[PDB]
Design a protein around this ligand. Structure first.
Ligand SMILES: *[C@@H]1O[C@H](CO[C@@H]2O[C@@H](C)[C@@H](O)[C@@H](O)[C@@H]2O)[C@@H](O[C@@H]2O[C@H](CO)[C@@H](O[C@@H]3O[C@H](CO[C@H]4O[C@H](CO)[C@@H](O)[C@H](O)[C@@H]4O[C@@H]4O[C@H](CO)[C@@H](O[C@@H]5O[C@H](CO)[C@H](O)[C@H](O)[C@H]5O)[C@H](O)[C@H]4NC(C)=O)[C@@H](O)[C@H](O[C@H]4O[C@H](CO)[C@@H](O)[C@H](O)[C@@H]4O)[C@@H]3O)[C@H](O)[C@H]2NC(C)=O)[C@H](O)[C@H]1NC(C)=O
Lengths: 13, 209, 87
C-alpha cells in the first residue's frame, strides 16, 4: 500500500 | 583573505521521505576569490566517482567573494541506505583540495510515537489555544512535522528542535495555535508526521474537543 | 522589549500512550519574554529529575515558548500522586 499526504504521494511498499 | 571554505549539506528530510520529491546533496564553496573563481568539483558515492552533478550559477557576494555551488541528486533509497556522499573541491587558492563527506546518521532507526494533546483546561480562558503534537522515541532525528485541518495545511504552528533523549532517540513537540473559537466549533485537527521508520514514512493523529 | 509573564500548563499523558511502560507528562510554558527561564518538576513535594526541556522557541507574537517532558514509570501514574510543572 501507499501513504498520501494532502494528495501528494509519500511512499509505497 | 582565505582561500575558500566548503560546506556540504544533506537533503531535506521531507525530500528523502517523499517519493514524489527529489532529495539532493549540496556542496557549497564560499570565499572563492575574484582572481581565481574557477572551482573543480569531484563527487563520489561510497568511494565511487559519479558524473551527474550540476553546477549552479556562480553567485556574486559583493564582498570580494563568490559562492560556488554543486548539486547532486540522490536516490531516496540510497540516502536511506546510508551511502556516503563525498564532494572534493579544487581551487588555485587551495594548497590541497578540500574533501567533505556526509551520509545519514548511523544507528538503529526507531519509529516515532505520536500523541496529540488538547489545550489545558487552564488555557480555555484565552483568545487562542494550543494543540500539542508530542513526537518521541525517533531515530534518526530527520523528521517532518506539519499540521492540517479539513484538508488544508495550517501554517500557524511552531516546532521545537529535536532534543536528544537519554536512550539516544529524539523527541520534539509541535505547537499549533488556533483561535479558541475554531477549537470551540469542534473542528478536527491533525498532526501529520513523516519519518523513515513509520510504515510508508507517514503517520497522522487527530484530535478535537 | 517589556518583560512578559509566562502561562504554564501541565498536560497529562494521552490515553494512547498508556500502552507503554513509561508515560509523558508535558509542560507547555508560553508567552514569556525574555527567553531566560527555569523549569522544575515535582510530585507531592519531592523533586523529579527524569525530564528534558526544549530550548525556547521564538513564537509568532514575539514572545517565547518551550516544552518540558517528564518521563515517569507508568506504575506511578497509577499510584496517583500529582505531577506538576513550575517555572
Ligand atoms: C562574504 O559573504 C558570504 C555570504 O554571506 C552572506 O552575505 C553577507 C553580506 C552577510 O550578510 C552574511 O551574513 C551572509 O551569510 C559569506 O558566506 C558565508 O560564509 C560563512 C562562513 O564564513 C558560512 O558559515 C557557515 O554556515 C553554515 C550554515 O550555512 C547555512 O545557513 C546559513 C544561515 O544560517 C545560510 O545563509 C547558508 O546559505 C546555509 O544555508 C543552507 O544552505 C543549504 C545549501 O544551499 C540548504 O540546503 C539545501 O536547500 C535546498 C533548497 O533551498 C534543498 O533543500 C537541498 O536539498 C539542500 O541541500 C539549506 O536549506 C540552507 N539552510 C538555511 C537555514 O539557510 C554553518 O553550518 C557553518 O557552521 C560550521 O562551521 C563553523 C565554522 O565556520 C563552525 O563553527 C560550526 O560549528 C559548523 O561546523 C558556518 O556558520 C555561511 O553559510 C556563508 N553564507 C552563505 C549565504 O553562503 C562569506 O563568509 C563572506 N566572506 C568574507 C571574506 O567576508
Amino acid at each position: 500500500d501507499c501513504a498520501w499526504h494532502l494528495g501528494e504521494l509519500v511512499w509505497c511498499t | 583573505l582565505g582561500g575558500p571554505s566548503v560546506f556540504l549539506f544533506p537533503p531535506k528530510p521531507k525530500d528523502t521521505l517523499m517519493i514524489s520529491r527529489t532529495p539532493e546533496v549540496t556542496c557549497v564553496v564560499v570565499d572563492v576569490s575574484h582572481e581565481d573563481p574557477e572551482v573543480k568539483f569531484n563527487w563520489y558515492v561510497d568511494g565511487v566517482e559519479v558524473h551527474n552533478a550540476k553546477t549552479k550559477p556562480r553567485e556574486e557576494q559583493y564582498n570580494s567573494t563568490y559562492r560556488v555551488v554543486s548539486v547532486l541528486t540522490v536516490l531516496h533509497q540510497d540516502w536511506l541506505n546510508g551511502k556516503e556522499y563525498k564532494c572534493k573541491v579544487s581551487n588555485k587558492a587551495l594548497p590541497a583540495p578540500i574533501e567533505k563527506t556526509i551520509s545519514k546518521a548511523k544507528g538503529q532507526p526507531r519509529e516515532p510515537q505520536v500523541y496529540t494533546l488538547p489545550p489545558s483546561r487552564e488555557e480555555m480562558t484565552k483568545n487562542q489555544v494550543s494543540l500539542t503534537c508530542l513526537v518521541k522515541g525517533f531515530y534518526p532525528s530527520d523528521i517532518a512535522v506539519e499540521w492540517e485541518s479539513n484538508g488544508q495545511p495550517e501554517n500557524n504552528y511552531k516546532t521545537t528542535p529535536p532534543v536528544l533523549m537519554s536512550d539516544g532517540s529524539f523527541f520534539l513537540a509541535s505547537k499549533l495555535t488556533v483561535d479558541k473559537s475554531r477549537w470551540q466549533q469542534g473542528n478536527v485537527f491533525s498532526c501529520s508526521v513523516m519519518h523513515e521508520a513509520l510504515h510508508n514514512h507517514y503517520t497522522q493523529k487527530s484530535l478535537s474537543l
